[PDB]
Amino acid sequence: HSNEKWFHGKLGGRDGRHIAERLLTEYCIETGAPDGSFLVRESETFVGDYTLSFWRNGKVQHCRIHSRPKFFLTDNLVFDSLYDLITHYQQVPLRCNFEMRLSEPVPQTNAHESKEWYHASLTRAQAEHMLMRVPRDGAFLVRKRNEPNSYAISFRAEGKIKHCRVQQEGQTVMLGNSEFDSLVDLISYYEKHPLYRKMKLRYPINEEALEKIGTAEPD
């Protein structure tokens, strides 16, 4: 279930219900998503269990998923995995004192946070310092900017460090006039196609990378 579009894991500790409501509201109002659009997260009330959160005409509903490997919404219908429970309830509706068939998964917009090239706290000067110690064109990093939902790709090209602004615009990311589903998708595209002149993103830079392929002092 870990790589599934709909599996968000632990959201935030006990603020996860409100985070899930926000994520579903954002996806659903933005894309014009149908009822039953959903995500699964770790329960913050029932530890070890999961919570299914879904869209219902502007209102978010939450249902407990018991995990004993036995997964279930009701003591009547038990599944071996979270994928099987979700797949079954996409074809057959779940009942409450309304009926709801699960429809489209709400994907995570933050999968970049675990990538080796991503830095949540890094200044423009800080990125230039790190990249001037990597004498390879195509060395790059992505850093969060001070504006919310704004990032920068810092890269080495023609012996100098250049920067590109990436904007998270609702459920997609924009780099100039090019649009991707997420920051991870944008970076994976620019590793196979040039971002600046003929330069592709080739060498992801972090602290571990600097001790291996980096110099002690900048140029």
Binding site: R124, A152, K162, H163, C164, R165, L175, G176, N177, S178, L195, Y196
Partner: peptide
Amino acid sequence: DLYEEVL
């Protein structure tokens, strides 16, 4: 401009 344009 501090940031490069991409088209």
